[PDB]
Ligand binder design. Structure first.
Ligand SMILES: C[N+](C)(C)CCO
Ligand SMILES: C[N+](C)(C)CCO
Ligand SMILES: [Cl-]
Length: 302
């Protein structure tokens, strides 16, 4: 059986000497938005319909968590201004539960501030995450705390590895975990060195593209990863794209074309390096069309 037939424990089937950068990982864009039920606001603000545990059982291993500091000890999960009905502990609790059940998987968790803090807040978003989550005794043992800037599956499995979008941080473990953080370009394909030049991050995050330009941008970075065997290069390729507003195409509309187009491309490439591909409506299938999460999983060599 191919790896995608067992998406709950697909990492457990790989050689754990691989660096995570070398694994082809499916991620979900604005992971926590599955809570939204308002159909007007959902056109533009909603990007998933499966909850965190269901995304995990479906093979998603990179979670894009964007937040707003709602109290000096709390980060709320957001899509910009839009509150997603939960705080960050809910994601961490679900991740902890999953990684205990499937201990040979690793989760990569991106953390970004997506909106200004509540007026009562006195601490920076980075301070709050560092002191009330990362260093919270409650999450002892949950996070990758090692000092390798390019960690392997063996040393990260069972744990969450921080992918730091917060800017400079005093946290010392995970991608971008130094006082420079990651220099991220708005609406662009870009490359930037992270972890004190230890890694070359290559991102396609042109989130305001229209359809044909977005497919072009995804396939261009997909083609670069295919010929790049350098373990010190890390590829993050967002398939997700913004709606132009409620009267325009929904994010689901675009996902419904992009996901199968890119899934078709990957499958026709066979077992080639893709990088980490971040998608809307992860696990959403359309009869007759290739499933992007399954095809990213099956692209991994055994
Ligand atoms: C979604 N289509 C491929 C039909 C057109 C692009 O906007
Ligand atoms: C018909 N779908 C939108 C499901 C796939 C298009 O390519
Ligand atoms: Cl801040």
């Amino acid at each position: 059986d191919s790896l995608s037939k067992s998406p709950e424990n697909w990492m457990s089937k790989l050689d754990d000497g691989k660096h995570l950068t070398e694994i082809n990982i499916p991620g979900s864009h604005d992971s926590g938005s599955f809570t939204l039920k308002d159909p007007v606001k959902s056109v533009w603000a909603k990007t998933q319909d499966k909850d965190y545990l269901t995304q995990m059982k479906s093979g998603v291993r990179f979670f894009d968590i964007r937040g707003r500091a709602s109290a000096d000890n709390m980060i709320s999960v957001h899509h910009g201004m839009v509150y997603l009905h939960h705080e960050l502990g809910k994601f961490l609790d679900d991740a902890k539960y999953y990684l205990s059940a499937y201990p040979n998987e690793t989760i990569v968790m991106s953390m970004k501030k997506d909106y200004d803090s509540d007026s009562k807040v006195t601490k920076t978003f980075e301070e709050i995450f560092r002191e009330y989550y990362y260093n919270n005794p409650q999450y002892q043992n949950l996070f990758y705390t090692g000092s390798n800037a390019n960690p392997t599956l063996k040393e990260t499995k069972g744990k969450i590895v921080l992918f730091n979008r917060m800017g400079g941080t005093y946290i010392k473990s995970g991608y971008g975990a130094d006082t420079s953080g990651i220099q991220w370009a708005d609406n662009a394909t870009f490359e930037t060195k992270i972890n004190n030049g230890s890694l070359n991050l290559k991102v396609q995050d042109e989130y305001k593209d229209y359809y044909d330009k977005k497919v072009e941008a995804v396939k261009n970075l997909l083609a670069k990863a295919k010929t790049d065997s350098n373990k010190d290069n890390v590829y993050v390729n967002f398939l997700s794209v913004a709606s132009g507003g409620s009267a325009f195409n929904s994010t689901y509309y675009y996902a419904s074309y992009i996901n199968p187009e890119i899934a078709k491309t990957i499958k026709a490439n066979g077992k080639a390096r893709t990088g980490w591909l971040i998608v809307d409506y992860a696990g959403y299938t359309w009869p007759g069309y290739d499933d992007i999460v399954s095809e990213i999983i099956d692209s991994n060599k055994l």
